[PDB]
């Protein structure tokens, strides 16, 4: 069924699962035409597919050429996502295939269920969590590879860097959602927080800075403060 706070430890058990987020698949800029009408121009996008236990991120880049000459792009994008997820599963050895795929928006259920009819033992599930994965494009290295791509391409990352050497997957996931929620609520402040200190750097093979245990607690506290802040500024509290 659906995925919520009562079964949240399930994400970190030993059944392979993937989250699929389609919020950045179809991306547009809206602008005025010479005649004073409005038109859209698409820009590259991505499917964000993540194993929450391992941190493995299967980032499928959606090049704008996949929309050329297509109609009803918002609907096509859900089916394109499902096709790519199905192709990914099929590419994985059987022992690496997920037992569950959890979609962050309910509109993906039918498209993915249809594309995975071949896989009746794989459960397709929604979630009641409001996960902040749409902010994935605020991670500079991810945004850079999407915007530079000249063709469809799959790029693999670990979204937890080396964190699992020191913390559990539950704590790594919680850190990730806090960081992404902050970037979603106020990207400038979140980024200032993360990079203010010039002595903490991002290793070439990582996405986030190389914080010690102590500095991650400071950082985590500052991100909570930010998410409290903007919540006041937003609601005047």
């Amino acid at each position: 069924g659906a995925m919520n706070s009562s079964n949240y430890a399930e994400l970190f058990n030993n059944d392979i699962k993937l989250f699929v987020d389609d919020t950045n698949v179809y991306r547009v800029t809206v602008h005025k035409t010479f005649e004073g009408n409005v038109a859209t121009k698409a820009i590259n996008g991505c499917i964000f597919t993540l194993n929450p236990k391992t941190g493995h991120l299967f980032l499928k880049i959606i090049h704008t050429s996949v929309w050329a000459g297509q109609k009803r792009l918002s609907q096509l994008a859900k089916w394109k996502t499902a096709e790519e997820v199905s192709a990914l599963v099929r590419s994985l050895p059987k022992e690496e295939q997920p037992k569950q795929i959890i979609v962050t928006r309910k509109a993906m259920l039918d498209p993915l269920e249809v594309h995975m009819l071949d896989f009746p033992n794989i459960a397709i599930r929604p979630t009641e969590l409001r996960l902040p994965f749409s902010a994935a494009m605020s991670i500079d290295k991810l945004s850079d590879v999407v915007m530079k791509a000249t063709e469809p391409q799959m790029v693999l990352f670990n979204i937890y860097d080396d964190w699992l050497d020191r913390i559990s997957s539950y704590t790594a996931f919680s850190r990730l959602t806090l960081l992404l929620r902050a970037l979603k609520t106020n990207e400038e402040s979140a980024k200032m927080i993360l990079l203010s200190d010039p002595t903490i750097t991002i290793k070439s093979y990582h996405l986030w800075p190389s914080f010690t245990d102590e500095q991650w607690i400071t950082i985590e506290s500052q991100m909570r403060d930010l998410i409290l802040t903007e919540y006041g500024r937003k609601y005047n509290v």
């Binding site: 096509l76 089916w79 039918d110 498209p111 269920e113 249809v114 594309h115 009819l117 071949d118």
Partner: protein
């Protein structure tokens, strides 16, 4: 004109014959139904005065044999039987019609209702849906489940309707997942019409049979089947023009005949609103939309 005689009516019962019905009181001198129009299937059905639980009944075609009803006090129901020797069957039926012990099937001459509800229903196809081959007539009741209901218990007492499932490998071609899911024309026309039903008359006959079992017995699996078969047509972008026109006529008479007080349970709000207002065929069911909107505007 043919006759369904009764040995007796030992228990009080409401008797249905097609869309008509009348009450028989316990041990009332009733010996059956006469003047039944030849040329159409028929259904004779029962609801006991004591136990409204279990509506039940028999689909039959008078051209296929000489049938009578005998109450069975062990199984507790009115059973349809077959008389082998036609000579003796005629000796009894005449004797009773002389003593005027029968209700007359009450067809109005302006009324084509029964015809319009059973146009495509054939007894040979009923017997494939209801598997009990040693009888030329077919028993149905309220509680019988469908083959698909047994997949989601007794297989012998099931309704073997054609399984329709929009999220199945049969409904969806590899590589056209989106196309086939949003426009069901492949499943309707290639899989079902050409592959399984052979023609639209057999498709419409199953649809009509499913509605009648829903309406007369409150059979829930039949109601699901009727809606499924409507939805598959309405959700197909490419449907022969003559099927659409006939569909509109079929549904119009079904909606016309439906008891107003049963609409809440027999009509699926989602299917009808989708079909009339959202689907590829939203503009193709003029008669049906007009009657639905004037008779059941609540549902919409």
């Amino acid at each position: 004109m043919n006759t369904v005689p009764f040995t007796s009516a030992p228990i009080e019962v409401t008797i249905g014959i097609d869309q008509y019905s009348f009450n028989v009181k316990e041990n009332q001198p009733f010996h059956g139904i006469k003047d039944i129009p030849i040329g159409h299937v028929h259904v004779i059905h029962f609801q006991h005065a004591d136990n409204s639980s279990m509506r039940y009944g028999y689909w039959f075609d008078c051209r296929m044999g000489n049938f009578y009803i005998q109450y069975d006090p062990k199984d507790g129901l009115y059973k349809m039987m077959e008389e082998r020797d036609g000579a003796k069957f005629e000796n009894i039926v005449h004797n009773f019609k002389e003593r005027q012990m029968m209700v007359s099937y009450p067809k109005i001459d302006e009324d084509d209702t029964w015809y319009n509800l059973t146009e495509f229903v054939q007894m040979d196809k009923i017997r494939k849906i209801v598997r009990k081959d040693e009888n030329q007539f077919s028993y149905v009741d309220s509680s019988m489940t469908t083959v698909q209901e047994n997949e989601l218990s007794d297989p012998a007492h099931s309704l073997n309707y054609t399984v329709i499932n929009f999220k199945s490998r049969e409904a969806i071609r590899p590589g056209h997942e989106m196309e086939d899911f949003l426009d069901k024309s492949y499943y309707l026309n290639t899989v079902m019409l050409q592959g399984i039903f052979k023609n639209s008359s057999n498709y419409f006959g199953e649809l009509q049979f499913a509605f009648l079992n829903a309406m007369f017995f409150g059979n829930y699996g039949s109601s699901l089947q009727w809606h499924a078969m409507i939805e598959l047509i309405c959700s197909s972008a490419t449907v022969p023009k003559h099927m659409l026109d006939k569909l509109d006529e079929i549904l119009y008479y079904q909606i016309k005949t439906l008891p107003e007080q049963y609409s809440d349970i027999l009509l699926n709000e989602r299917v009808w609103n989708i079909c009339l207002y959202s689907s590829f065929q939203k503009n193709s069911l003029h008669n049906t939309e007009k009657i639905m909107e004037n008779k059941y505007p609540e549902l919409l």
